[PDB]
């Protein structure tokens, strides 16, 4: 799974295609801003407030 070159293009073409699709089309994480910590403060621990 981590190294696609191990999957044979001839013996397992469908599996190689599926692995490539998984690597190049899985969703990408992102972030957004929320809250008003002026009054409520911030309770975030492992992330920026």
């Amino acid at each position: 799974f981590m190294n696609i070159q191990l999957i044979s293009p001839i013996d397992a073409p469908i599996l190689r295609q599926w692995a490539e699709i998984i690597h190049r089309y899985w969703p990408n994480p992102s972030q957004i801003r929320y809250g008003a910590p002026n009054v409520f403060g911030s309770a975030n621990l492992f992330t920026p407030p």
Binding site: P37, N38, G41, P49
Partner: protein, 417 residues
């Protein structure tokens, strides 16, 4: 906006070590092990409604000085070139966690090992410490109290405050926020502002910073006596019913009688008390604390080298070759200046001035006697114990009990308007 983060530690007042010991340190850390004790100090002074006192903390300035001494003596461990945080002890105390979160009793091995010998009048840069460099919010939160300590330790007199007058500061949001403090006192306003600053560091030219500068200017103008009920700064002033009292209370107020005329421009200067009786004046210490909280991201002007001792010269962010002069004053003489200015303005009479003078004289006598007695007790304790010498209040000299540049300071503050 500030670009360099430097601070100065306290200097020995004739002793051979930092004037603090285990008893004072334990009394300070009695209810919390965090060395950053601004909120604890605010709670202890109890809104400045009365004269706070204790066995080990005679005055509020005493606690302020002890906080400064504790921070100065403790911060020298992680600021060694090796930058190790938890391998050496200072007065049976060790840091917990590299992020400088609290002080705890030393482990048995460190207790057996010798302690650290601290030095006097050290100047340090916050960005040298790796963790402070890595985390901006942590550095900005700490630098407020570091700046307050520096403003107290810069000279041998009382703390330093910054006064600025500028008409362009006022705006709609500033007016809306300022109108909400119509009936509150200076101590309450300072409490709320300090808590807000602690929750969030302010930016360079924010609403909170501008309102803080406006409040400081209003308080100092009212204290001098340029602004009063019949001569207001945009219908705002500070009222004090009992001038010259031991614990003065100042209340924000509005009046539609008259508004003074303000010349356009931007002016500012630096004020400080010289007489030792500042230890029992909450308002001055709170003003200095507000200036320190402002200093986090504002980059105030430079202070002239000739107004500070040799060891405080050429600090990268604070002192400089050509800078503003420090104006020092005496409280008792400033009371007389206040009364005289009001009488010339025509809103006070001779009998009222005489009553205020008598009350001020009584207060000065009481404070002088108490301070001298406490100093003598400290001297005797230091004589008795040669291995745990300490000071409970910032040392002073007999010469500081006389009037200094009070007239010039009053004239400068009056000309500010």
């Amino acid at each position: 906006a500030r670009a360099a983060f430097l601070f100065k530690t306290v200097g020995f007042g004739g002793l051979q070590n930092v004037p603090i010991n285990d008893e004072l340190s334990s009394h300070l850390l009695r209810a919390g092990n965090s060395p950053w004790q601004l909120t604890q100090f605010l709670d202890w002074i109890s809104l400045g409604r009365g004269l706070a006192t204790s066995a080990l903390v005679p005055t509020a300035g005493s606690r302020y000085y002890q906080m400064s001494c504790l921070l100065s003596g403790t911060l020298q461990i992680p600021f060694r070139p090796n930058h190790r945080w938890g391998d050496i002890r200072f007065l049976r105390l060790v840091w917990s966690a590299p992020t400088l979160d609290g002080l705890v009793v030393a482990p048995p091995q460190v207790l057996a090992q010798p302690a650290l010998q601290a030095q006097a009048d050290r100047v340090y840069d916050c960005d040298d410490y790796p963790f402070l460099a890595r985390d901006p919010r942590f550095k900005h939160r700490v630098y407020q109290q570091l700046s307050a300590v520096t403003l107290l330790n810069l000279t041998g007199f009382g703390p330093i405050s910054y006064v600025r007058v500028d008409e362009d500061m006022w705006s709609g949001d500033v007016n809306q926020l300022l109108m909400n403090y119509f009936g509150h006192t200076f101590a309450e306003i300072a409490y709320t502002l300090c808590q807000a600053s602690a929750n969030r560091p302010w930016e360079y030219d924010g609403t909170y910073a501008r309102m803080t500068q406006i409040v400081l200017s209003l308080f100092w103008l009212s204290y001098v006596g340029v602004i009063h009920q019949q001569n207001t700064y945009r219908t705002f002033y500070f009222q004090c019913n009992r001038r010259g009292d031991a614990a003065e209370v100042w209340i924000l107020s509005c009046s539609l009688n008259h508004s003074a005329q303000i010349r356009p421009g931007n002016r500012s200067l630096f004020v400080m008390p010289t007489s030792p009786d500042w230890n029992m004046d909450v308002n001055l210490i709170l003003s200095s604390t507000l200036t320190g909280c402002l200093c986090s991201g504002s980059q105030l002007p430079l202070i002239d080298n000739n107004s500070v001792p040799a060891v405080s010269r050429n600090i990268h962010g604070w002192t400089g070759r050509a800078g503003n002069q420090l104006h020092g004053f005496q409280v008792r003489r400033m009371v007389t200046e206040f009364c005289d200015r009001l009488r010339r303005d025509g809103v006070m009479t001779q009998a009222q001035q005489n009553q205020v003078e008598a009350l001020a004289d009584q207060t000065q006598q009481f404070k002088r006697d108490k301070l001298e007695t406490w100093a003598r007790e400290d001297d005797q304790y230091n004589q008795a114990h040669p291995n745990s010498t300490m000071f409970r209040t910032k040392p002073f000299t007999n010469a500081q009990w006389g009037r200094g540049n009070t007239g010039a300071t009053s004239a400068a503050i009056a000309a500010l308007i």
